[PDB]
Design a protein around this ligand. Structure first.
Ligand code: U61
Length: 139
């Protein structure tokens, strides 16, 4: 998929895998009629999701979880701000740290997500699906 105006669903290969210090940029638009989209940091061969980010416009929630061997873990929903309202442009920054994913939206800290798949270098797929339009995705 291209870096600029990639269509959804976006399927991108993280070559060498998710290494520490790896920063993924997503700039995009939530349509006015959008219900939900997902960003998945996924182990393709197994289907596992180290980090799943699910903005849901219905209740204005930003749901974080992992899918590890067909099990959805505890949901993390705590935010100080929701930048994914209908008709909103967003500049999302996702850094894979040693112990935690670190996610900023429009320069403002959104959430931390402690690693659940400790072996996160096995993540080789970035996937963006659902009610989102993409202007730029940097892997
Ligand atoms: O906790 C995060 C997940 O919630 C799922 C709903 N759900 C949650 C649970 C659940 C069950 C037990 C738990 F301890 C925790 C959670 N069971 N079913 C969504 O289907 C699941 N999801 C949404 C999507 C999705 C894909 C493409 C576009 C938009 C959404 N894919 N998977 C994800 O949001």
């Amino acid at each position: 998929p291209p870096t600029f105006n990639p269509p959804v669903p976006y399927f991108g290969r993280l070559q060498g895998g998710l290494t520490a210090r790896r920063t993924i940029i997503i700039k995009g638009y939530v349509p006015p009629t959008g219900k939900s989209f997902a960003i998945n940091f996924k182990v393709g061969s197994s289907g596992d999701i180290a980090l799943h980010i699910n903005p849901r416009m219905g209740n204005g929630t930003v749901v974080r979880n992992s899918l590890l061997n067909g099990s959805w873990g505890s949901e993390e929903k705590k935010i100080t701000h929701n930048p994914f309202g209908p008709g909103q442009f967003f500049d999302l920054s996702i850094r894979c740290g040693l112990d935690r994913f670190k996610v900023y939206a429009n320069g403002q800290h959104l959430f931390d997500f402690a690693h659940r798949l400790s072996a996160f270098q096995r993540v080789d797929t970035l996937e963006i699906q659902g009610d989102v339009t993409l202007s730029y995705v940097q892997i």
